[PDB]
Amino acid sequence: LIETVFVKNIRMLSFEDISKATHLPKDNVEHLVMRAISLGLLKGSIDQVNELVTISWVQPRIISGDQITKMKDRLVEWNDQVEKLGKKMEARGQSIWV
């Protein structure tokens, strides 16, 4: 369960994904998320009425080779966001920067 939550970039996952992933019935999902929050492996909330489990904290983990590559990707995308924004704001309001 923790592996899947780490690599997935979205911070909410439906219960159906966990049930098929883990080869456990859906009854057993509620036990497992509960056991996990108590151990403190993960923190979050359980919504039965959207059938989501919302993680809000993940415990540090080793960062495999493959994963080092992933970080670079997320940061490259965020470079472009900073950069495109800065351009507009450099251009507009040229009159005053003093």
Binding site: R92, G93, S95, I96
Partner: protein, 266 residues
């Protein structure tokens, strides 16, 4: 020469008329020098102005039937200031009345309600009670029912127009099509689902198969007897969203702070 054109119209070959008009256009230079170009009228001058008008008139009418827009607009353009000038002395005719009706029907067919209302102001005094409303009545009525948005009345007027056709059919056939596009627009905002029958009834098709055909041309899929207006409308907005004009028209909240500051500091 000048009379050969007048008799060519009555013959019924309106293509003969058209081939003969480049020669008679040369003679139209002469008629123009005879009249002082609308700067004082006398009894020499009323005949001269009269001949000029006859040649144009059978041309106006011939062009309309042969769907030759250009010629009609020009000929008519001339007729308009001539008739407008002066006090009555022969500056109105039965031909005037017919010609203005046909003209107004072209404007309804292009769906240019902007010019139609303006054109009516220019025309106004002449058609108040000195040609009255007799044939001119046909577009006046027509404007009224589509403003109210009773499409039922409008539609009925065009079909019943069969007994009024004299060359009116060149605008009347078109004006059916215009009705179909206006209604088509409306029915999207209302609902997403209409049965087959209902689509035909509002849009006034006489054939159910022709209905489904029109739906493809209108870029609507009808599936299992139900329209699915849902597709294209959404698609169009997504397509509109990519263009270039585009930042200030869309309006960015970021831009609001930047514009406010430079005002002050100027």
């Amino acid at each position: 020469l000048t009379k050969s054109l007048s008799i060519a119209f009555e013959n019924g070959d309106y293509a003969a008329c058209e081939k003969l008009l480049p020669p008679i256009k040369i003679e139209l230079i002469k008629n123009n020098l005879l009249i002082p170009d609308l700067s004082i009228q006398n009894d020499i001058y009323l005949n001269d102005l009269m001949i000029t008008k006859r040649i144009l008139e059978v041309g106006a009418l011939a062009s309309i039937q042969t769907f030759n827009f250009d010629s009609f607009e020009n000929y008519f353009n001339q007729l308009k200031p001539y008739y407008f000038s002066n006090n009555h002395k022969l500056s109105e005719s039965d031909k005037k009345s017919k010609l203005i009706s046909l003209y107004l029907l072209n404007l309804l067919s292009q769906n240019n309600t902007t010019k139609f209302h303006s054109e009516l102001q220019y025309l106004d005094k002449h058609i108040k009670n000195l040609e009255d409303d007799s044939l001119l009545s046909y577009p006046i009525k027509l404007d009224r029912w589509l403003m109210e948005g009773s499409y039922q009345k409008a539609w009925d007027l065009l079909q019943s127009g069969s007994q009024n056709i004299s060359e009116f059919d060149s605008f009347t056939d078109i004006l059916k099509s215009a009705i179909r596009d206006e209604i088509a627009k409306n029915t999207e905002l209302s609902y997403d689902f209409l049965p087959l029958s209902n689509i035909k009834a509002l849009l006034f098709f006489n054939n159910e198969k022709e209905t489904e055909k029109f739906a493809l041309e209108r870029n609507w899929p009808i599936v299992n007897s139900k329209v699915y207006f849902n597709n294209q409308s959404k698609e169009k907005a997504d397509y509109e969203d990519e263009m270039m004009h585009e930042e200030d028209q869309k309006t960015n909240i970021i831009e609001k702070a930047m514009d406010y500051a430079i005002s002050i500091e100027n």
